[PDB]
């Protein structure tokens, strides 16, 4: 790390610069997802896969 650089925080491709989304953005995005989910109480996407 620091040469290879961490990949996407919310994608595949573990090792590489490749213009990730920011952690500071990611925590806000995840908080928005958490609040919508719990309020809404929709099942997971995987349930819709199941």
């Amino acid at each position: 790390l620091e040469i290879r650089g961490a990949g996407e925080l919310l994608g595949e491709e573990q090792s590489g610069s490749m213009e990730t989304i920011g952690f500071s953005l990611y925590m806000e995005l995840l908080e928005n997802a958490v609040d919508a989910l719990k309020a809404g109480r929709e099942p997971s996407l995987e349930d819709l896969t199941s």
Binding site: E19, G22, F23, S24, L25
Partner: protein, 36 residues
């Protein structure tokens, strides 16, 4: 307005006095939405 210009070594209290916050993260811009 002003008279002279004074230069000195910047004390850490003075540096915290200048600043209007503290930068914690290294992300610059969303690159698709232009909100920082």
């Amino acid at each position: 307005e002003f008279d002279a210009i004074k230069i000195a070594l910047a004390s850490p209290d003075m540096i915290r006095s200048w600043s209007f916050g503290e930068v914690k993260k290294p992300e610059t811009i969303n690159y698709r939405t232009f909100k920082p």
